[PDB]
Design a protein around this ligand. Structure first.
Ligand SMILES: O=C(O)[C@H](O)c1ccccc1
Length: 113
């Protein structure tokens, strides 16, 4: 399937133990996609002071369309040193590895895979 319904645990930035997916745009997009497949991906909602507490390159989920079965359609966009790889809509948050942190909420998304 081209899209997969996922429920992403929303984590507080100060709880996150592993603050990015790796060291290159290509690696972080690869690792994000793997963690989204394996159910080991969390979402941090972006506000003032969040991104400097996480590791670049960043992986964002961004709205790809204006929401089947409650699931917002999203795609992945990476960022390194102020350059974005991908073009998409509003940021829903930044993806990180999930290693057992307790979430504050779930974000229902339909991920373009
Ligand atoms: O196809 C799968 O195994 C799975 O749906 C999946 C989820 C997220 C990204 C890629 C693939």
């Amino acid at each position: 399937k081209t899209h997969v319904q996922l429920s992403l645990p929303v984590l507080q930035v100060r709880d996150v133990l592993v603050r990015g997916f790796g060291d290159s745009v290509e690696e972080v997009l690869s690792e994000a996609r793997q963690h989204l497949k394996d159910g080991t991906c969390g979402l941090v909602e972006v506000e003032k002071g969040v991104l400097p507490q996480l590791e670049q390159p960043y992986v964002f989920i961004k709205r790809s369309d204006a929401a089947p079965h409650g699931h917002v359609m999203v795609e992945l966009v990476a960022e390194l040193e102020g350059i974005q790889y991908g073009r998409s809509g509003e940021t829903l948050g930044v993806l990180v590895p999930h290693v057992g942190e307790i979430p504050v909420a779930y974000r229902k998304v339909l991920l373009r895979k």
